[PDB]
Amino acid sequence: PNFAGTWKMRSSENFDELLKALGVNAMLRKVAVAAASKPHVEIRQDGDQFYIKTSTTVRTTEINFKVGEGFEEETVDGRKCRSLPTWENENKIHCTQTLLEGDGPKTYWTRELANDELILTFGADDVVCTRIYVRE
Numbered sequence: 482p483n484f485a486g487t488w489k490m491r492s493s494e495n496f497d498e499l500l501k502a503l504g505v506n507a508m509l510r511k512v513a514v515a516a517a518s519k520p521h522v523e524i525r526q527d528g529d530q531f532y533i534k535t536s537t538t539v540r541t542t543e544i545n546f547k548v549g550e551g552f553e554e555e556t557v558d559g560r561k562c563r564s565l566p567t568w569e570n571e572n573k574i575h576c577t578q579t580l581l582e583g584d585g586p587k588t589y590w591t592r593e594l595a596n597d598e599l600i601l602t603f604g605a606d607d608v609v610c611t612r613i614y615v616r617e
């Protein structure tokens with residue numbers, strides 16, 4: 482499956498509840514939720530090699546990884562973590578995160594390519610956030 486290209490968000494669900502579950506300050510969530518509404522996503526892929534740039538006005542993250550090989554990135558709430566990308570299935574990547582410093586909610590994300598739509602999922606313990614993207 483090809484995740485490469487530029488994507489824009491079609492819908493988000495529970496992004497605020499996610500930030501709640503991760504203990505983010507109501508005023509920060511206000512800013513985050515706002516910025517997260519109009520995110521721009523760039524994905525360059527080469528087999529298991531992935532480049533994903535996510536941009537908003539107040540924060541842009543650039544992650545690079547090889548499915549099957551751990552890498553370092555940040556959690557949704559900015560905490561630096563250790564990540565473990567894996568092919569859950571042919572078109573879905575599952576990624577487990579373990580915080581480098583401190584302790585917190587068990588988090589992970591999963592990116593799935595389904596019907597030319599990119600389904601992004603953020604988990605913070607029991608809370609699940611679903612963000613659907615379409616090819617811009």
Ligand SMILES: CC1(C)CCC(C)(C)c2cc(NC(=O)c3ccc(C(=O)O)cc3)ccc21
Pocket residue numbers: 505509510512513516517520535536537539540557558559601612
């Ligand atoms: C105000 C500030 C600095 C506070 C710290 C946290 C709470 C860490 C934070 C998080 C975001 N996150 C996003 O903007 C975002 C956009 C798109 C996606 C996605 O769909 O991939 C995910 C997250 C934006 C701003 C901030």
